[PDB]
Amino acid sequence: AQEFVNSKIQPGKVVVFIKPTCPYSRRAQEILSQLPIKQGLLEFVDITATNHTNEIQDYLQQLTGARTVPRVFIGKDSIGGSSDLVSLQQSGELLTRLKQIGALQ
Ligand SMILES: N[C@@H](CCC(=O)N[C@@H](CS)C(=O)NCC(=O)O)C(=O)O
């Protein structure tokens, strides 16, 4: 799983890796769902509807370090899992990461 995630994560683009089954990944879908992100800039990547599930997480691991669900990526910069994203949203550092790249409206 190399060109898989690398082809989706790009500067000024938000992408979330989830597993439709664990409520934590859903939390990431629930929050960023309320974020005024540009057009098709925000997405939700179900590493299950593509097979090689372990290959992507195995890649998320080497790409970032943790293989937990979810796995968000503001631009090519990873922010962490779900508990990581929220910590940033309430802190406001999140929208900032979106601002420096212009991922928001
Ligand atoms: N709370 C974690 C995410 C929670 C999570 O994803 N836990 C389980 C699924 S809910 C996990 O990732 N398991 C990885 C596996 O099953 O291999 C974080 O924010 O990093």
CATH number where 23 lies = 3.40.30.10
The residue segments making up the domain with residue 78 are 1-105
Solved how? NMR
Distance of CA 80 to the CA centre of its chain: 8
- Tell me the C-alpha distance between 5 and 18, whole Å: 12
The number of folded domains in the chain is: 1
- Tell me the C-alpha distance between 58 and 52, whole Å: 10
Which numbered atom of ligand 1 lies nearest the CA of 19?
A: 9
Instruction: Output the CA 38–ligand 1 centroid distance in Å.
Output: 27
Q: What is the DSSP letter of 51?
A: S
The residue nearest atom 10 of ligand 1, judged by CA position, is 22
Are 6 and 34 in contact, with CB atoms under 8 Å apart? no
Are 19 and 46 in contact, with CB atoms under 8 Å apart? yes
For the chain, strand residue ranges (E) read: 14-18, 42-46, 71-74, 77-80
Q: How far is CA 55 from CA 1, 58, 60, 70, in A?
A: 5, 5, 9, 15
